[PDB]
């Protein structure tokens, strides 16, 4: 009958880059 | 002959942090 | 004998959102 399963495979690739952050705060009064 | 391939590896690390957001809106008029 | 290593894991989660962008420019003069 078949031999034992092999070792676990390696870790996956990193996820995709995160989303751009939100807009910054409004500038100061002119 | 060799047994079955091992189990699939774990999920990878998180992706790189996202870029900084767009510049904020201009301030109010002086 | 034991099988070959398993397949590579799935991708990690998406990166975190970036930080808020730079502050806006100063408003126009009154």
Residue numbers in the entry:
A (entry chain A), B (entry chain B), C (entry chain C): 1 to 30
What are the paper's exact sentences on this?
We solved the structure of CMP 24, bearing the Xaa position Val residue, with the sequence [H–(POG)2(PRG)(POG)2(VOG)(POG)2(BrF–OG)(POG)–NH2] to 1.25 Å resolution. For one CMP we included a 4-bromophenylalanine (BrF) residue for phasing using single-wavelength anomalous diffraction, but molecular replacement was successful for both structures. In the structure with the Xaa position Val residue, a void is present along the surface of the triple helix at the site of Val incorporation. This is a result of Val's secondary backbone amine being sterically unencumbered compared to the tertiary backbone amine of N-substituted residues like Pro, Hyp, or peptoids. The consequence of this hole is solvent exposure, clearly indicated the presence of a water molecule next to the Val residues in our structure. This water molecule is well-positioned to hydrogen bond with the NH group of the Val residue at approximately 3.0 Å away. Importantly, this water is also positioned in close proximity with the Cα of the Gly residue adjacent to the Xaa Val approximately 3.3 Å away. This Gly Cα corresponds to the azGly substitution site in our model system. In addition, we have reported two new collagen crystal structures, with the first structure of a collagen triple helix containing a peptoid residue. These structures, containing either a Val or NmetG residue in the Xaa position and reveal how the NmetG residues protect the collagen backbone from solvent while the Val residues expose it.
